[PDB]
Amino acid sequence: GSMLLEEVCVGDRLSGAAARGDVQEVRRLLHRELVHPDALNRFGKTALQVMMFGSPAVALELLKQGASPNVQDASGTSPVHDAARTGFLDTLKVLVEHGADVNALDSTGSLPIHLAIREGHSSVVSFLAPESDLHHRDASGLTPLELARQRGAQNLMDILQGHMMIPM
């Protein structure tokens, strides 16, 4: 016959729940529903890929199971990429710090930090600064410090400048 193997019913399950931002569902989900971390929606995205970096505990819940945060789709945009430009330094750092691929890029070659710089989240930008490739630069020719000089939302280039390194 055709279509005899289906493993999506559980996909979007935890995927739509964790992304919808519901620490209550994400909690009882694994603690009860034992939902899988690789759960993929109809399309084919992981929970972390859809996650709304809303509830901090929700992030740890997903990663607590066994999901691969190193996922990219359409313009190579992983959880870190969205969490940055979106504005969720809360759950962002949780996963970002844990391991979340916060170094990759979105095809063009812009580090998740660059986006935060053009945003002006203040915390996110300065945060994603040291939590990224403190050296790489966009195809344009700007780095964490340079981009900070552009979108001078405030003491941007200052935060990244200090955390940068400068051992002299």
Swiss-Prot record:
Subcellular location: Nucleus; Cytoplasm
List of residues that carry N-acetylmethionine: 3
Chief location: nucleus
Biological-process GO terms, alphabetical: autophagic cell death; DNA synthesis involved in DNA repair; negative regulation of cell cycle G1/S phase transition; negative regulation of cell growth; negative regulation of cell population proliferation; negative regulation of intrinsic apoptotic signaling pathway in response to DNA damage; regulation of G1/S transition of mitotic cell cycle; response to retinoic acid
Covalent S-S links between cysteines: none
Entry keywords, A to Z: Acetylation, ANK repeat, Cell cycle, Cytoplasm, Nucleus, Repeat, Tumor suppressor
Stored InterPro entries: Ank_Repeat/CDKN_Inhibitor (IPR050776), Ankyrin_rpt (IPR002110), Ankyrin_rpt-contain_sf (IPR036770)
A GO term from the CC aspect: nucleoplasm
One Pfam family cited in the UniProt record for this chain: Ank_2
ANK repeats: 43-71, 75-104, 108-137, 140-167
Recorded GO MF terms: cyclin-dependent protein serine/threonine kinase inhibitor activity; protein kinase binding
SMART domains, per database record: ANK
Known partners and oligomeric status: Interacts with CDK6.
Family to which this protein belongs: Belongs to the CDKN2 cyclin-dependent kinase inhibitor family.
Function: Interacts strongly with CDK4 and CDK6 and inhibits them.
Protein name according to UniProt: Cyclin-dependent kinase 4 inhibitor D
Encoding gene, per UniProt annotation: Cdkn2d
